[PDB]
Write a protein that binds this ligand. Structure first.
Ligand SMILES: [Cu+2]
Length: 105
């Protein structure tokens, strides 16, 4: 794949790793909608709202399969470790008007 998943389900905001690149989800938006990282970086999304949110990459973007991330409740987090350069678009499954991208370079 182009990313590995440290944890298939969400974990507490306080448990975010040292060195992770954090994207907040607040005000019904990915607060960094275009994030630039390097190969081997871990990106961690943190849901700051009552409404659940995820990140969803369609098939062919992070790998053969779609990556439909788990729904994060308020103050939960979810990480992806990017292992290959590219441009990776995502949305929220529940709220597809929420769009973001990670650029790995
Ligand atoms: Cu959402």
């Amino acid at each position: 794949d182009k990313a590995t998943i440290p944890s298939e389900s969400p974990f507490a905001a306080a448990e975010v790793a040292d060195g992770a690149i954090v994207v907040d989800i607040a005000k019904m938006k990915y607060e960094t909608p275009e994030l630039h990282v390097k190969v081997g970086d871990t990106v961690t999304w943190i849901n700051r709202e009552a409404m659940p949110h995820n990140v969803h990459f369609v098939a062919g973007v992070l790998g053969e399969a779609a990556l439909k991330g788990p729904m994060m409740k308020k103050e939960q987090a979810y990480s992806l470790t990017f292992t290959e350069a590219g441009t990776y678009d995502y949305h929220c499954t529940a709220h597809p008007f929420m769009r973001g991208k990670v650029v790995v370079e």
